[PDB]
Amino acid sequence: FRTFPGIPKWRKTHLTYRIVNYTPDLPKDAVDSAVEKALKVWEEVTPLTFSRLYEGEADIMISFAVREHGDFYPFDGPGNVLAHAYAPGPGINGDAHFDDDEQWTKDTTGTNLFLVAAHEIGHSLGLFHSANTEALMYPLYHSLTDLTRFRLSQDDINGIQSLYGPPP
Ligand SMILES: [Ca+2]
Ligand SMILES: [Ca+2]
Ligand SMILES: [Ca+2]
Ligand SMILES: [Zn+2]
Description:
Helices cover about 25% and strands about 15% of the residues. It is an alpha/beta fold and about 170 residues long. It has one domain: Collagenase (Catalytic Domain) (3-Layer(aba) Sandwich), CATH 3.40.390.
């Protein structure tokens, strides 16, 4: 596993999130279930806890975006870059953007929203890319991960725990 340099990490245990907008590709309920499951992946193995906000500035603002979207890192149309996310910190840091030129899905028929969300949230919590090929944080996770038996690898757990420790 790896971290960003200077090891940016959140300095509190309870984090807020907010779903700013919704993709046309899926029912709203599926977008929400997907983010929730992505958050629980990491919640499950640390002392971190999360709550949802509906107005205001949450730590981790989640949005769907195409091409230029008001940061310096435009999306690239279909495939390739699926989503990007900033390391822990104030403002845009911690936030996660999802390229709506992908077809987001709840199964494996398009780009699976849960899988990319969990990987992106990895980044929002302070994990950089893993050299381990079965880790969620391995940059090709998207092609290499089986869905019905999903299991955070030990490399991911070792990584997020080095930052926040194990759960209470
Ligand atoms: Ca933020
Ligand atoms: Ca793309
Ligand atoms: Ca789309
Ligand atoms: Zn962006």
